[PDB]
Design a protein around this nucleic acid. Structure first.
Ligand SMILES: Nc1nc2c(ncn2[C@@H]2O[C@H](COP(=O)(O)OP(=O)(O)OP(=O)(O)O)[C@@H](O)[C@H]2O)c(=O)[nH]1
Ligand SMILES: Nc1nc2c(ncn2[C@@H]2O[C@H](COP(=O)(O)OP(=O)(O)OP(=O)(O)O)[C@@H](O)[C@H]2O)c(=O)[nH]1
Ligand SMILES: *P(=O)(O)OC[C@@H]1C[C@@H](O)[C@H](n2ccc(=O)[nH]c2=O)O1
Ligand SMILES: [Mg+2]
Ligand SMILES: [Mg+2]
Ligand SMILES: [Mg+2]
Ligand SMILES: [Zn+2]
Ligand SMILES: [Zn+2]
Lengths: 187, 73, 929, 186
RNA sequence: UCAUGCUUCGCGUGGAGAAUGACGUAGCAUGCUACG
RNA sequence: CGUAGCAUGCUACGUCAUUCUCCACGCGAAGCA
């Protein structure tokens, strides 16, 4: 290109050829000068091809390094997020009940499905119609999973508070089923 | 003709209701969905028109949602 | 009545019980009964006409007819003595029917008679045949058996479809009313085998020699041996009886105290998960003389045939144990000093108890791979959640991960009014027209995903005929012999789209691209190596689809977590690609219908069958109702390509991972965890390719049942009679695989039962003469197989037949076939339902797609799909395509106008004119490329 | 394709060749003319590619900008563009019950619940003026949705029961409008 | 807001080949001048 | 016949410039099963 010295040789050859043409030289010198111009232009183009190739090669590695440096950052971010999620769940579980039931295991192994049944402190019931409510969680206290649960809240499908007096057979058509009942393990 | 116009209109009516935030009322949205689907699967036009009357009453009930004078100008 | 009445008096035989001739006195009575036969000449399980016995029915004091019959048979004088001796040996066993041997003067000389006293009208063979060859067109033995034993009343069958498992799920209760009788039959069979062994007698037990009270008779083929070396043969007995054990829920009494149905249930220890002793006790109680080793835990099995054999018994025995003991087994470990609860094993219903080989108590730090394993684990998520009791489903609910329940609705579609008005102006949608709108977007309310999930109630525990399945699997593995498979490295895997969801919990931090970029190839290879020694339980999310349909259903798909998908790709992708890259095979995944592919597929399925007829079907709710045994079978067929890269232990742990991840894992639906009973998760890595294995398995089963229930004496061809004899031998008398006969049977099926399979879609070209003579399967054999092996009734709306090959299959992949002239020759072309194309034009799932000027290339694809309609004899069908071309032209005109208005430069695009002319679209169906 | 300086040379050079064959001069002249013409043609054909690329880039930019603008316009006025479509289509249907209820709603006579379809039907409507009341009601029969309903209760605006005899020509001011009318499908 | 298969459209990178133009090195053929 | 010089014709290789056909991947948009 302009920086490359070959441009200097090409410019010198072109200037010499132009001056000789203006000077009206014999002819053989003109042929030699046009030969010089042709060879100089060929060499300049040969070097400019390599210059452009190197330019593209340099330009196509910055993208790669930026991509790798961004992927490393994202990997660190997700690593921290997963660690924080795991450590938050550690303190959301009641340790006393879990330890008591997992020390009674013969070899330390227990089924997973019996962890919330015997250890969970809150119970959630989804009731689709009134007959199920009557047969499942009638009153302010009921029994489930060999435990006694005291009802502390009822809401409807719109997340609106419902009073236990409103839950009657005649008033059922006025409620947005299903109802979600939240209760706490008694004693 | 007439049975294809009712179904295309019920689709647009349910789209309009869905923009007015009728999904916030589960009891009302369930009824609207049932009417819309029963109109789509219909073979007799009188059934479709009565169900359309029922479904448009939902829009006309919520008076403040839309102004009928400007829309019916 | 001197001769015919003194015969009845002697038949009474000092029991003096109110006999009444069923026949005509001293003459024999003819019956049409199911028999299990194998001799030098015939072999099968079919219905034969027997005319060798007189029958007398007993009645009560009130003259009521009861279900007690005296069956008197005459035979040679040597069989008489032989049976008398063998009976005197086995006389004292309480599981033996009471016999009486005498001689009577029939015409002028003494004839010896053997009388069996107080038998039931039907046998166990009759019940098994009725339930395994079910035809709603004629089920009289079944109805009579149901009404005789107080399972239901006679007016129960006046209901429109009392038999359908889906339209009438109460039929399961009626069938379950038969369980205790079958259990008593099993107990008496074990008693009888003990008596034979202690008395020194050798013989084969068949279902037709035992009545419905469990008592045994006959003894005509028993040999006498040393008084302690008796050998009962009970292989065909048990194997034929197996499918009826789970349908009648025979072992229900095992859930009660003292195995008594009146006492209350057993209350097990809640922390108990290992029932190996109970499983062995059950096996020794019922299948005592079954003489193949049973492994309660399938990690100890010798090969995949052993895994199937023992998983069948595990399926049977798991119905007795509490549902809370199955699933991940958790344990408390310490990471850097803080305690975690992690999965260290798994209790499967089919595979038993499995324990991880790399459990690291007292760790120090977790790397990226360990964090991935612990985050995908349901243990930590469920341990810290609330207790859940969801009464909207019969599914088992585990926990709620939030304080609120999530309700998600489905919105309606968007109406493209410009296209509808254009089509109307062109003369569409008029009254009394053959083309009308049928495909819409159906809206749903907030209880939609839970309802579609609850459709998993159609999955029931199903025990199979194991000897039949072990032959069908060898035959099914022949259809997959042209492919190559094996494990690949993490850098050889091809992921089509990386902008998909990663699943729970990974969907809250990024897409699949995040995790494929964060993990290096070494991390991915380390995870894959981990899964060959350990089980990783996974959580699956249920996602609603938003598509156009003619039905009101709302489908849910399974988003599987990326931890499962990443390793499943590395395990299965080579074989999947090899299947998808092959032409001319039975499975036609990866073959396009363009450029003459449809014609090639039809000519390949037609093959060179002799008397061709076509038939086809489509499974109803394929993924919900698929039995677990057949899903495991499909998984094992695909892993037979790993005979060099993996050992038996590695392959068992890959199977266990797949089962714990896409068969019985935890499901998240609305912020809550449920336990999936079984079936297939549509959304795993091998769904479409496992569906095909399951499909051809059902077809092969139908053919085997067709051939083995034919009367062998009435087969004209000697080759087919020999084939049937050998088939029975290889099913029930041969223990090791016979490769020559598998090759012979595969060639027979290829010659007479050509198939074209794509997931749960099938087209069969079959030899009509053989099918009419009972030598190949029909549509009714397929219906029987699906009834007793799939728990679904297939109606005539899901299956079709066609006796003319020049009009092609009725439907396949929603396409109809047309034989049209294309240049010089006639070819088959596929065309769609015009309503589908028009509805896709009229209703869209995005508001910006109602502006056609932005979506001109959207209509070009629809016109490509609609082109073959121009060659339909109906003119409206032909007009759909021209309507689309005219609309494309109108859209381009409008776009040019808008470009010239908003801006002031013409676009200068002299290339789009090809899109509203029919040559561009005709080039898509020509065989040129 | 004119308007490019290079072409202005090429054609002129071409002109010479067009004349040169007529002259039939020495070969060397023809060869030099051919060389010059080829050089000019190469320059023109190298410069034409630049303009073609620029034009294609401009067309791409125009299409993308048009698409973005149209998508934004379509999304912005989604709520107002749908109600107009709905009422145009309702007018097109030209049903009797639909037109009745819409014309009533234009006067404020709107329903309180979903219009039932069964004989055991509960309807509640709001009547905000006496003129509309006499137009729809006469005695104890109520006309709405092209059906006939039996009036049961006419609750005043302050919840106080109103007797059908009170509602007449001269009692329009005495009562508190709007009234709420309960009717059962006949 | 999943797994797979096929197809259309647009943009880009690269390899192979085809045509055209400019220039260079070498080899062969023909024509003209000086010397041996 | 050889050395030197100039002109024209042909062959081989090399170098760039321009257009066009197929293929391999990449990226985006869409349709169907
Ligand atoms: N329980 C029962 N079986 C019957 C009755 N009537 C006919 N049968 C049939 O007849 C058979 C009884 O005769 P078997 O002692 O089994 O004689 P078989 O097996 O027919 O032997 P061959 O006829 O000698 O080949 C049973 O297997 C039944 O299928 C009946 O009233 N009760
Ligand atoms: N992963 C995935 N699988 C699909 C999808 N659509 C269909 N399939 C699979 O193809 C099988 C057959 O599909 P269908 O015949 O439509 O569905 P179906 O569940 O059998 O329902 P019906 O036959 O219509 O009762 C399904 O069970 C799925 O496993 C999809 O969108 N995603
Ligand atoms: P078409 O009639 O929609 O289905 C034919 C067959 C059923 C299914 O196995 C498979 N399929 C269809 C649609 C889809 O999105 N995925 C898929 O695997 O093809
Ligand atoms: Mg018998
Ligand atoms: Mg199906
Ligand atoms: Mg299908
Ligand atoms: Zn085993
Ligand atoms: Zn392997």
């Amino acid at each position: 290109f302009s920086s490359l010295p070959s441009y200097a040789a090409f410019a010198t050859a072109q200037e010499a050829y132009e001056q000789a043409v203006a000077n009206g030289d014999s002819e053989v010198v003109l042929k030699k000068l046009k030969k010089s111009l042709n060879v100089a232009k060929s060499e300049f183009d040969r070097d400019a091809a390599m210059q452009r190739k190197l330019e593209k090669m340099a330009d196509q590695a910055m993208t790669q390094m930026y991509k790798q440096a961004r992927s490393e950052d994202k990997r660190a971010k997700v690593t921290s997020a997963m660690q924080t999620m795991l450590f938050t769940m550690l303190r959301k579980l009641d340790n006393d009940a879990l330890n008591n039931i997992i020390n009674n295991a013969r070899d330390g192994c227990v089924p997973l499905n019996i962890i919330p049944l015997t250890t969970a402190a809150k119970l959630m019931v989804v009731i689709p119609d009134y007959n199920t409510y009557k047969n499942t969680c009638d009153g302010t206290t009921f029994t489930y999973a060999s435990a006694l649960w005291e009802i502390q809240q009822v809401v409807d499908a719109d997340s609106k508070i419902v009073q236990l007096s409103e839950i009657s057979m005649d008033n059922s058509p006025n409620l947005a089923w299903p109802l979600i009942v939240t209760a706490l393990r008694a004693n | 003709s007439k049975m294809s116009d009712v179904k295309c209109t019920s689709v647009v009516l349910l789209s309009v209701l869905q923009q007015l935030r009728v999904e916030s009322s589960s009891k009302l949205w369930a009824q609207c969905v049932q009417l819309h689907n029963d109109i789509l699967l219909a073979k007799d036009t009188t059934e479709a028109f009565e169900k359309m009357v029922s479904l448009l009453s939902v829009l006309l009930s919520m008076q403040g949602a839309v102004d009928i004078n400007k829309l019916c100008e | 009545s001197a001769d015919a009445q003194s015969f009845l008096n002697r038949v009474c035989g000092v029991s003096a019980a109110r006999l009444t001739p069923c026949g005509t006195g001293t003459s024999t009575d003819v019956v049409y009964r199911a028999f299990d036969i194998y001799n030098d000449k015939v072999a099968g399980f079919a219905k034969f006409l027997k005319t060798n016995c007189c029958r007398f029915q007993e009645k009560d004091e009130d003259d009521n007819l009861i279900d007690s019959y005296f069956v008197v048979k005459r035979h040679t004088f040597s069989n008489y003595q032989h049976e008398e001796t063998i009976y005197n040996l086995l006389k004292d066993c309480p599981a033996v029917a009471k016999h009486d041997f005498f001689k009577f003067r029939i015409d002028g000389d003494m004839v010896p008679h053997i009388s069996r006293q107080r038998l039931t009208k039907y046998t166990m063979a009759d019940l098994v045949y009725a339930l395994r060859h079910f035809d709603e067109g004629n089920c009289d033995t079944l109805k009579e058996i149901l009404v005789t034993y107080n399972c239901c009343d006679d007016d129960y069958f006046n209901k429109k479809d009392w038999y359908d498992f889906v339209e009438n799920p109460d039929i399961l209760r009626v069938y379950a009313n038969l369980g205790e009788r079958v259990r008593q039959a099993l107990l008496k069979t074990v008693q009888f085998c003990d008596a034979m062994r202690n008395a020194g007698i050798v013989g084969v037990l068949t279902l037709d020699n035992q009545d419905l009270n469990g008592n045994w008779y006959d003894f005509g083929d028993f040999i006498q041996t040393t008084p302690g070396s008796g050998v009962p043969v009970v292989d065909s007995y048990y194997s034929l009886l197996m499918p009826i054990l789970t349908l009648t829920r025979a072992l229900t009494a095992e859930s009660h105290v003292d195995t008594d149905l009146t006492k209350p249930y057993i209350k097990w220890d809640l922390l108990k998960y290992d029932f190996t002793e109970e499983r062995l006790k059950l096996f020794d109680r019922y299948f005592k003389y079954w003489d193949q080793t049973y492994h309660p835990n399938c990690v100890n099995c010798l090969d995949d045939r052993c895994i199937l054999h023992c998983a069948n018994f595990n399926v049977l025995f798991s119905t007795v144990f509490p549902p809370t003991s199955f699933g991940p087994l958790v344990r408390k470990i310490f990471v850097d000093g803080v305690p975690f609860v992690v999965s260290t094993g798994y209790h499967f219903r089919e595979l038993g108890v499995v324990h991880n080989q790399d459990v690291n108590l007292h760790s120090s730090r977790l790397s990226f791979k360990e964090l991935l394993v612990y985050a995908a684990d349901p243990a930590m998520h469920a341990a810290s959640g609330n207790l859940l009791l969801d009464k909207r489903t019969t599914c088992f609910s585990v926990a709620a991960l939030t304080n609120n329940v999530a309700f998600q609705t489905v919105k309606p579609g968007n109406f493209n009014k410009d296209f509808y008005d254009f089509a109307v102006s062109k003369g569409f949608f008029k009254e009394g027209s053959s083309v009308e709108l049928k495909h819409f977007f159906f809206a749903q309310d907030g209880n939609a995903a839970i309802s579609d999930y609850d459709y998993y109630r159609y999955n029931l525990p199903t025990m199979c005929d194991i000897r039949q399945l072990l032959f069908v699997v060898e035959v099914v593995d022949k259809y997959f012999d042209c492919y190559d498979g094996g494990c690949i490295n993490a850098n050889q895997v091809i992921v089509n789209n990386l902008d998909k969801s990663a699943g729970f919990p990974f969907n809250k931090w990024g897409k699949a691209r995040l995790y494929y970029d964060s993990m290096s190839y070494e991390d991915q290879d380390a995870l894959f190596a981990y899964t060959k020694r350990n089980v990783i339980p996974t959580i699956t999310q249920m996602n609603l689809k938003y598509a156009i349909s003619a039905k009101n259903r709302a489908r849910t798909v399974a988003g599987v977590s990326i931890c499962s998908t990443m390793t499943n790709r590395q395990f299965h992708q080579k074989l999947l690609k090899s299947i998808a890259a092959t032409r001319g095979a039975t499975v036609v995944i990866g073959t396009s219908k363009f450029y003459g592919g449809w014609h090639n597929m039809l000519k390949t399925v037609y093959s060179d069958v002799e008397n061709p007829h076509l038939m086809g079907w489509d499974y109803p709710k394929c993924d919900r109702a698929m039995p677990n045994m057949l899903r495991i079978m499909a998984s094992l067929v695909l892993a037979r390509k790993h005979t060099t890269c993996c050992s038996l232990s590695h392959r068992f742990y890959r199977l266990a991972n797949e089962c714990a991840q896409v068969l019985s894992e935890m499901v998240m639906c609305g912020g809550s965890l449920y336990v999936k009973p079984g079936g297939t998760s549509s959304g795993d890595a091998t769904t479409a390719y496992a569906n095909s294995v399951f499909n051809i398995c059902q077809a092969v089963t139908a053919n085997v049942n067709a051939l083995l229930s034919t009367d062998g004496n009435k087969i004209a061809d000697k080759y087919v009679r020999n084939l049937q004899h050998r088939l029975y031998e290889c099913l029930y008398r041969n223990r090791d695989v016979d490769t020559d006969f598998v090759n012979e049977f595969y060639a027979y099926l290829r010659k007479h039962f050509s198939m074209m399979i794509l997931s749960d879609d099938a087209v069969v070209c079959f030899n009509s003469t053989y099918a009419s003579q009972g030598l190949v399967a029909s549509i009714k054999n397929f219906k029987s197989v699906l009834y007793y092996q799939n728990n679904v009734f297939m109606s005539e709306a899901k299956c079709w037949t066609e006796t003319d090959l020049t009009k092609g299959p009725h439907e396949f992949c929603s396409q109809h076939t047309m034989l049209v002239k294309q240049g010089d020759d006639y070819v088959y072309l596929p065309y769609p339902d015009p309503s589908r194309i028009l509805g896709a034009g009229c209703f869209v799932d995005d508001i910006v797609k109602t502006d056609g000027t932005l979506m001109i290339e959207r209509f070009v694809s629809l016109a490509i799909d609609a082109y073959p309609l121009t060659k339909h004899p109906n003119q409206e069908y032909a007009d759909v395509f021209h309507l689309y071309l005219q609309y494309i032209r109108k859209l381009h005109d409008e776009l040019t106008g808008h470009m010239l208005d908003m801006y002031s430069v013409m676009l200068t695009n002299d290339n789009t004119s090809r899109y509203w002319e029919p040559e561009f679209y005709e080039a898509m169906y020509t065989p040129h490329t």
